[PDB]
């Protein structure tokens, strides 16, 4: 009647933390997409010069 | 008796799990975009390495 | 007790899978991420050498 309550409160706090952690990974993951993005640009800038001196 | 604030919290948790799924979808679409761009870069650099190595032999 | 205890107990288990499912879809997303940062640090390694040479 009551023991069940105190158990759900704990169960809910577990779900709450599992969700918080997954949020953190998405945050990290988007941060990594930003890096990937600024990296593909530098890779492109780095390629044009090379593919031009050979467009013979 | 906190049976009412448990259900509120479960709405909040369920509300956030939804938002999570929406994020997974979108960034699925971003990985897909970045993988396609990467294949183009990989090819082009290979060609350069090819045309460039053909230069060596002569 | 309103049977509200039943709904909560039900939501708990439901939300449980969701997260477990979601935690999996995430693990798979993180894997796609490294393979990119990997083949990409390897593309920039092949290009850095022959850049200031051409």
- Can you give the CATH number for the domain in which A17 is found? 1.20.5.170
Q: Are B48 and A47 in contact (CB under 8 A)?
A: yes
Range of the domain at C30: 1-54
The distance of A53 to chain C (nearest Cα, Å) reads 7
Question: Using only C-alpha atoms, what is the Rg of chain B?
Answer: 25
CB distance B37 to C38 below 8 Å: no
How many distinct structural domains can be found in chain C? 1
Q: What is the DSSP string of chain B?
A: --HHHHHHHHHHHHHHHHHHHHHHHHHHHHHHHHHHHHHHHHHHHHHHHHHHHHHHH-
Which residue out of A8, A24, A53, A55 would a mutagenesis test of the C interface target, given it has the greatest number of C Cβ atoms within 10 Å? A8
Closest residue in C to B19 (Cα) is C22
Q: What six digits make up the tokens of B17?
A: 């799990």
Q: d(Cα C25, Cα C37) in Å, to the nearest integer?
A: 19
Is A43 in the B-facing interface, judged by CB distances under 8 Å?
yes
Do residues B10 and A17 make contact, with C-beta atoms less than 8 angstroms apart? no
Number of B to C CB contacts under 8 A, please give it: 54
First CA to last CA distance, chain A: 84
Closest to A29 (Cα-Cα) out of B14, A41, A37, C15: A37
Select from B4, B10, B21 the residue whose CB has the most chain C CBs within 10 Å, as the one to mutate to test that interface: B10
Q: Do C50 and A54 touch (CB under 8 A)?
A: no
Closest CA to B38 of C51, A32, A40: A40
Cα–Cα distance measured from residue C2 to residue A36, given in angstroms and rounded to the nearest whole number? 52
Contact predicate A22/C22, CB 8 Å: yes
Angstrom distance (rounded) from CA A54 to CA A47: 11
State how far the Cα of B5 lies from the Cα of A8, in Å rounded to an integer.
Answer: 11
In a 3-state reduction of DSSP, which class is residue C51?
coil
d(CA B34, CA B36): 5
Q: Least CB-CB distance to A46: which of C1, C9, C47?
A: C47
Alpha-carbon Rg for chain A, nearest whole angstrom, is 25
**Could you give the residue ranges of the DSSP H alpha helices within chain C?**
4-41, 43-47
CA within 13 Å, CB half, B25: 6
CA-wise closest residue to A46 among C37, C52, C39, C41 = C52
Domains of chain B and any CATH numbers: 1-58 (1.20.5.490)
- Helices B3-57 & A3-52 angle (0-180, nearest 10): 20
Output the six-digit token pair for C26. Answer: 């995430």
Beta carbons of B45 and A47 less than 8 Å apart: yes
Q: Is residue A4 within 8 Å of B1, Cβ to Cβ?
A: no
- Count CB-CB contacts under 10 A for residue B44: 18
Q: How was this structure determined?
A: X-ray
């Amino acid at each position: 009647w009551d023991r069940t309550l105190i158990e759900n409160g704990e169960k809910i706090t577990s779900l709450h933390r599992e969700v918080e952690k997954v949020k953190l990974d998405q945050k990290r993951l988007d941060q990594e997409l930003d890096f990937i993005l600024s990296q593909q640009k530098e890779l492109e800038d780095l390629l044009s010069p090379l593919e031009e001196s050979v467009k013979e | 008796h906190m049976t009412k604030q448990h259900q509120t919290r479960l709405d909040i948790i369920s509300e956030d799990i939804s938002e999570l799924q929406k994020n997974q979808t979108t960034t699925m679409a971003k990985i897909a975009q970045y993988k396609r761009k990467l294949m183009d870069l990989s090819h082009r650099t290979l060609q350069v390495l090819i045309k460039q190595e053909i230069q060596r032999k002569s």
